[PDB]
């Protein structure tokens, strides 16, 4: 009851860290101490200061003696009673009781006199809005003209079956007996001249007998001409909508190529694993005394995906020209050997589909940056394909059971592209199709835009991550090529080959394997522990860069 | 421990919750245009309405043409000078009114088209007649998509909203109901309706809206009302790209806690189409199903309600979602195949009822929404 | 042009249609008139390829619309003038001086002029009116100044100050420089408005609207991992509350939590640890939840407000160190000094002594409490 009382302040100083923050904390404490800050405000401020330190904040709460209105909010201010007295003639006592007239808010006050940020849209979304703008333009004018034609023809058939002795003094009220006062005025002022529209309106109101039929005839001629122009505009709008709409609805996929070029590099993949290690080491000193021996976790539930990635790799190898043929076959059997040795798949299955710890199931690969980056590219392709496969059956059932509406088939509205040229997914399995298309994209016989359009049409933009499949498998092939053809890098592989092939190893074998791997690489390079389990195919990647030294 | 990540369940109607539906539509409301370059287009109402008729939906409801509001009726919430100015301004005599132009904000954002007073009268009359039909028990659900102008205030026009008809509808509901709950699923904050009922406990205004540097800037979490209306104005700030499952998991617990805590006698539901995906000004990623699950969940409670459509700047998506709302209010689920309407060329390329969500980032993390609904639930303990 | 061809008795005969072609070819939002359709030069890139039933139920509505009027409120319940104001230096609607190239706001004049009750003839500014009165007045200025001085005998020192401001045109009040220069944090905006250290630098038009689609300043539309990493140090921005940096992995970008930095102390905070839903790109500078407030309200149990003093430049500001250490009633305006072993044990013994003092205070009272009940 004494030691924590005298050590609380400098223990809190250690916790706050930054002196500055400690300076403002002492300012908060003095402001409470000078009968200026209320105790609840001090409590909240310390809660914002020592929130994660529960024990310290709990001690502060009970030692201080806290026991658990007028919150106006930031976006409302109070008017005086002078501006409240503004006559609203329709208000009885209930509206004067329940309506707020003193507290107001404005967008200008909420912006702090700075403005607002509009949401960014694609250029395809912008031209979609332009198409919608022109559609509303044509349809609003046509429907307003049609309503005026209906009213005028009602007046005309009322005036046709009557005689001429009272047709001279027959008049029309404003609005022409309709529920609107201005729609016919808008139509008249648009169709006729600006200065003559008003006098036509006056001639229609005073003498409708002569003015009404010629007005109806003009309006009908303008209506049929506008509808013909609207239909042969609607052809253009429909084709541009079919060209634009699915690209407009794609948001991450429109910029996924540059984002995948920028973020699937060595630096970002090192940054992710180092950030996870930094988070674990930062939260280790606070709680969780059993610190985990892993940072990244990868699951591998499906094994056919490995054969798909291998098929894509050999397709890129056969297609490419920058690599020699011995280098091509070394890439092929290096990838096949690494996949057969790291995981539980044998070489036969690959070929047909395209303190002594005895009988060990956990296998450790100690790697430098090159093997780690190559493995990260492989896991990137695996997760990208597994996202497609895990939803392959549902999207296949959706594409196969695509019942088109009847009036689009009768009036050939639906698009024909992605069909004549065979990019729809109807009649085939969706995953196989993707791989086939991809292979075609890798081989160069398929354009990038049509591949992206087919993927976003088939998967409803959920296959945006596969737009750069060729680039990532090219980078994976390049990383394997630099993996076997670099000094102090292929020897680490060979050491992994010896460790995996020779089972029934003790812990000291793992330690001497670790320092033998470290030997090949510099004392500055990064160590990666890639742990594989034969059961459940879980891969745990641990960052031990400059740790074992 | 409040927020739970729940996948989006398919929409199922309740056959034991049949409601008499009164739908309000004036045929003139489609013949008003805000401007040449303007996003607010009342024309989107009638191709919503043409989707109702063509879906035969009308049969399942009672169609009414509400009497347009007059000046005095309008002055039940707004001032006399603002309603006068609205009834007297035209694009012709704009140079006669510059002081009122800056005074009431009419101009620019809220333009001056010559059918302004008639459009506002149609909207206000639809709202007040729906509230009247709810008061007299002639219907259980009142539908009026011509209104929804939730940004209008006492003496100003903002957000493409001139007359706050929702305030008049809630006022008419207050003459027969002691407690009224207004729910705003528009992507914008319902600043006019919340400001109108900020200091009262008779109206609770819950607004699920995007709160960033977005319009209108109000609707921050600490805004809970002052005076007698303290903890009677719930604001739910959301980030960009909230999808159907996330929106369901924030909407359903909050609205459930309001029902079992505030216990309203009537419900007003602002069905903003700007919260849909692909919207011109909205920044949410809601599909039609995600927009419709809120209306189905609030229909499951059995409280007399009034569904009033507000925003929405892409006409096809808001029309399809309003048709699906109106179909859901008759305890049916419309098939995803459009019948032939006159405006059939809008809904390309698949010509189906579904509004497809975009594949943009659901940046609303579970921790942030858990904190937001924890603060909301803590504030809701005082509404008994 | 003789629209209604009336007869000799005034009876209507036939009207002639006006010039429909006067505005039949007005450009719509499509870029073409409504009379014609699209041109070929947009049909190349609009269409995919350019080589150079009526069962409507929508006409039955009017039969089934019943009117609704059942509401309770039914029935009744030469030189060109400047583009800126000469008084406030801001744009807007102006009244222009005729014989003077200065223009004023309608509200900026003495007296302010109604925008509907304009002067019928010519309007001059106060400086121009003074010039015409002097030109008109035979007496030289100094003669009129002296006559005003002797006429206003009751006030002599302000007589020149009273006289010379009739010549001055009305202007918006602006604080003088020596009022503003003593506070270095206080700046002046573009319109002359107040600005201080709690104000952001206004972002130029390039940053908001002239950026790419993927890179938006809101930082909500894409996965940007170059925000958890310090630019000048290269380390990771550890959030203060969660003590973590949720960078994500670009294969699961939903695991990445957004992080900002405070605009004063650069303390990084997650957007979920502090309840916020934006990055405060424009407006006031965001302040982390860790700073001390410059304005507080306390309940009297009315209320009492407290505001921190503004920063003052080193010439007019002096910092003093109290002689009294314990109980010095400062105003809250405080500055901390660095620390220069026996203090810890002295504190320890002081807390110890005071604690048995508190214990004996409790004991000497509770005995009286239990001895009260027998009587």
């Amino acid at each position: 009851s004494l030691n924590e009382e005298v050590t609380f302040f400098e223990k809190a100083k250690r916790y706050i860290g930054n002196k500055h923050l400690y300076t403002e904390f002492l300012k908060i404490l003095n402001l409470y101490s000078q009968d200026i800050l209320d105790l609840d405000d001090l409590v909240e401020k310390v809660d914002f200061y020592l929130g994660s330190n529960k024990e310290l904040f709990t001690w502060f709460k009970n030692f201080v003696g806290y026991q658990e209105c007028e919150a106006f909010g930031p976006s409302y201010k109070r008017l005086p009673k002078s501006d409240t007295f503004m006559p609203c003639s329709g208000r009885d006592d209930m509206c004067w009781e329940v309506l707020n007239d003193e507290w107001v808010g404005h967008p200008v006050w909420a912006s702090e006199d700075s403005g607002f940020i509009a949401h960014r849209k694609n250029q395809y979304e912008e031209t979609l809005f332009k198409i919608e703008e022109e559609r509303h333009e044509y349809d609003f004018y046509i429907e307003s003209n049609l309503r005026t034609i209906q009213c005028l023809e009602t007046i005309v058939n009322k005036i046709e079956n009557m005689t001429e002795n009272e047709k001279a003094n027959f008049k029309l009220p404003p609005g022409l007996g309709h529920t609107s006062m201005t729609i016919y005025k808008k139509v008249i002022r648009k169709v006729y001249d600006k200065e003559r529209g008003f006098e036509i309106i006056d001639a229609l109101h005073e003498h409708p007998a002569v003015t009404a039929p010629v007005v109806l005839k003009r309006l009908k001629q303008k209506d049929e001409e506008w509808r013909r122009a609207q239909r042969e505009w609607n052809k253009v709008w429909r084709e541009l909508e079919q060209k634009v709409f699915f690209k407009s609805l794609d948001h991450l996929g429109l910029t996924f190529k540059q984002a995948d070029k920028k973020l699937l590099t060595t630096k970002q993949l090192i940054s992710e694993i180092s950030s996870i290690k930094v988070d674990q080491t930062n939260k280790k000193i606070h709680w969780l005394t059993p610190k985990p021996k892993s940072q990244l976790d990868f699951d591998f539930p499906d094994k056919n995906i490995f054969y798909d990635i291998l098929c894509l790799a050999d397709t890129f190898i056969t297609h490419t020209t920058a690599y020699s043929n011995p280098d091509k076959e070394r890439l092929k059997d290096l990838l096949k050997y690494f996949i057969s040795l790291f995981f539980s798949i044998s070489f036969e299955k690959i070929e047909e589909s395209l303190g002594i710890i005895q009988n060990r199931s956990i296998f450790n690969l100690f790697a430098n940056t090159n093997i780690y980056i190559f493995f990260r590219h492989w896991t990137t392709i695996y997760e990208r394909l597994l996202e497609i496969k895990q939803m392959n059956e549902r999207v296949t059932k959706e594409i196969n059971t695509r019942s088109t509406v009847t009036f689009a088939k009768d009036l050939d509205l639906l698009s024909s592209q992605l069909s004549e040229m065979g990019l729809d997914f109807v009649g085939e399995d969706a995953y196989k199709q993707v791989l086939r298309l991809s292979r075609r994209l890798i081989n160069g016989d398929l354009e990038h835009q049509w591949f992206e359009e087919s993927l976003r049409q088939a998967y409803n933009n959920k296959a945006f991550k596969l737009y750069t499949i060729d680039k990532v498998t090219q980078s994976l092939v390049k990383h394997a090529h630099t993996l076997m053809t670099d000094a102090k890098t292929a020897e680490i592989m060979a050491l992994f080959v010896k460790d995996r092939n020779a089972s029934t190893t003790s812990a000291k074998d793992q330690i001497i394997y670790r320092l033998q791997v470290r030997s090949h690489m510099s004392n500055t390079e990064n160590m990666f522990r890639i742990e594989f389990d034969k059961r459940t195919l879980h891969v745990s990647i641990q960052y031990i860069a400059l740790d074992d030294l | 421990m409040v927020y739970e990540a729940t996948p989006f369940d398919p929409i199922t109607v309740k056959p034991s919750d049949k409601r008499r539906v009164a739908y309000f539509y004036d045929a003139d409301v489609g013949n008003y245009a805000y401007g040449a370059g303007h996003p607010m287009k009342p024309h989107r109402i009638r191709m919503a309405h043409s989707l109702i008729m063509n879906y035969g939906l009308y049969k399942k409801m009672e169609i009414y043409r509400a009497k347009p509001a007059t000046k005095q009726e309008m002055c039940q919430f707004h001032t006399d000078e603002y309603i006068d100015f609205l009834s007297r301004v035209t694009p012709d005599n704009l140079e006669m009114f510059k002081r009122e132009s800056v005074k009431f904000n009419v101009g620019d954002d809220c333009p001056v088209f010559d059918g302004l007073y008639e459009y506002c009268s149609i909207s206000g009359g639809g709202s007040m007649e729906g509230a009247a039909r709810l008061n007299r028990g002639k219907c259980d659900v009142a539908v009026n998509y011509a209104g929804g102008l939730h940004h209008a205030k006492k003496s100003e026009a903002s957000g493409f909203c001139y007359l706050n008809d929702i305030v008049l509808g809630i006022i008419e509901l207050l003459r027969y109901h002691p407690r009224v709950l207004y729910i705003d699923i528009d992507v914008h904050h319902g600043d006019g309706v919340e400001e109108a009922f900020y200091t009262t406990d008779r109206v609770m205004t819950c607004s699920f809206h995007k709160y960033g540097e977005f319009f209108p800037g109000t609707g921050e979490l600490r805004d809970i009302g002052v005076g007698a209306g303290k903890n009677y104005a719930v604001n739910v700030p959301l980030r960009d790209g909230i999808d159907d499952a996330t929106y369901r998991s924030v909407f359903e617990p909050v609205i459930k806690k309001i029902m079992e805590w505030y216990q309203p006698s009537a419900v007003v539901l602002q069905c903003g189409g700007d919260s849909l995906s692909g919207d011109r000004l909205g920044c949410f990623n809601l599909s039609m199903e995600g927009h419709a699950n809120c209306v189905n969940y609030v229909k499951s409670f059995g409280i007399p309600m009034m569904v009033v459509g507000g925003g929405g700047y892409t006409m096809r998506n808001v029309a399809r979602t309003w048709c699906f709302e109106t179909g859901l209010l008759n305890n049916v689920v419309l098939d995803k195949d459009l019948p032939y309407n006159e405006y059939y060329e809008y809904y390309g390329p698949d010509y189906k009822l579904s509004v497809r969500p975009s594949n943009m980032f659901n940046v609303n993390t579970p921790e942030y929404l858990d904190k937001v609904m924890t603060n909301i639930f803590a504030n809701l303990e005082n509404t008994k | 042009k003789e629209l209604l061809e009336k007869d000799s008795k005034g009876n209507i005969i036939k009207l002639n249609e006006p010039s429909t072609i006067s505005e039949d070819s007005k450009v719509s939002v499509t870029g073409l008139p409504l009379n014609k359709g699209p041109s070929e030069k947009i049909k190349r890139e609009s269409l995919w390829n350019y080589r150079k039933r009526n069962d409507l139920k929508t006409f039955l509505t009017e039969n089934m619309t019943e009117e609704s009027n059942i509401r309770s409120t039914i029935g009744w319940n030469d030189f060109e003038n400047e583009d800126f104001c000469s008084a406030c230096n801001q744009s807007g609607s102006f009244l222009c001086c005729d014989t003077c190239p200065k223009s004023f706001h309608f509200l900026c004049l003495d007296p302010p002029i109604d925008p509907n009750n304009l002067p019928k003839g010519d309007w001059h500014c106060n400086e121009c009116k003074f010039k015409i009165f002097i030109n008109n007045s035979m007496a030289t200025l100094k003669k009129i100044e002296s006559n005003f001085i002797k006429q206003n005998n009751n006030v002599k020192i302000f007589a020149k100050l009273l006289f010379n401001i009739d010549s001055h045109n009305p202007k918006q009040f602006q604080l003088p420089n020596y009022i503003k220069e003593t506070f270095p944090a206080v700046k002046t905006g573009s319109r002359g408005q107040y600005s201080d250290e709690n104000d952001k630098i206004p972002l130029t038009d390039r940053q908001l609207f002239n950026t790419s689609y993927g890179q938006s300043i809101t930082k909500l539309d894409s996965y940007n991992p170059d925000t958890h990493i310090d630019s000048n140090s290269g380390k990771f921005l550890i959030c203060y509350k969660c003590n973590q940096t949720r960078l994500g992995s670009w294969s699961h970008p939903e695991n990445s939590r957004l992080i900002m930095t405070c605009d004063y102390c650069q303390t990084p905070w997650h957007l979920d640890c502090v309840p916020r839903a934006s990055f405060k790109n424009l407006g006031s500078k965001w302040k982390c939840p860790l700073h001390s407030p410059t304005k507080v309200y306390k309940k009297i149990h009315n209320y009492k407000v407290w505001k921190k003093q503004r920063l003052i430049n080193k010439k007019n500001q002096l910092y003093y160190e109290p002689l009294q250490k314990i109980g010095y009633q400062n105003n809250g305006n405080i500055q901390i000094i660095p620390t220069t072993n026996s203090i810890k044990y002295d504190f320890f013994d002081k807390i110890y002594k005071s604690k048995m003092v508190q214990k004996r205070k409790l004991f000497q009272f509770q005995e009286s409490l239990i001895d009260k009940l027998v009587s």
Partner: peptide
Amino acid sequence: ARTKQTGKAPRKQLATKAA
């Protein structure tokens, strides 16, 4: 009395939904 504008009727268009 000669008058001239600026021609925006409202104010702070920047703080609006459509500017």
